[PDB]
Amino acid sequence: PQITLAKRPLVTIKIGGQLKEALLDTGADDTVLEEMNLPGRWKPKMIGGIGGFIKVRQYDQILIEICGHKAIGTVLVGPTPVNIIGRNLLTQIGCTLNF
């Protein structure tokens, strides 16, 4: 589709067999999900943003469906106040910016 930006670009996703919404985020290199249960091995990492840093669990090879398109890749889980799909999955679903 084509999504305008007068509102937050919040879309429906499926991950871990759960429906959620997430922000399609051109300014995020990575994908960061609100605190949840995911099965699998992970490893601690740390990410930085506006407020500073946070600890997150990194999981690789996680599948997510975003507005009907599938992507598989790394996902970080931690205390973000919003789920964020970053350029790592956005490129897989063919997403681009246009003006």
Which residues between 50 and 89 bind its own copies (CB under 8 A)?
50-54, 67, 69, 80-82, 84, 87
- Partner that binds at residue 36, options ligand 3TL, its own copies, none, CB closer than 5 to 8 Å by kind: none
- The residues carrying an active-site annotation are 25
- Contact criterion met (CB below 8 Å) for 15 and 69: no
Query: Could you give the CA distance from residue 58 to residue 88 in angstroms, rounded to a whole number?
Result: 14
- Contact criterion met (CB below 8 Å) for 10 and 21: yes
CA dihedral defined by 29, 74, 21, 80, rounded to 10 degrees? Answer: -70
Residue among 17 and 81 whose Cβ is closer to ligand 3TL? 81
Q: What is the DSSP letter of 87?
A: H
- At closest approach, how far in Å is the CB of 68 from its own copies? 10
Which residues between 26 and 85 bind ligand 3TL (CB under 6 A)?
27-30, 32, 45-50, 80-82, 84
Residues that bind ligand 3TL (CB under 6 A): 25, 27-30, 32, 45-50, 80-82, 84, 86
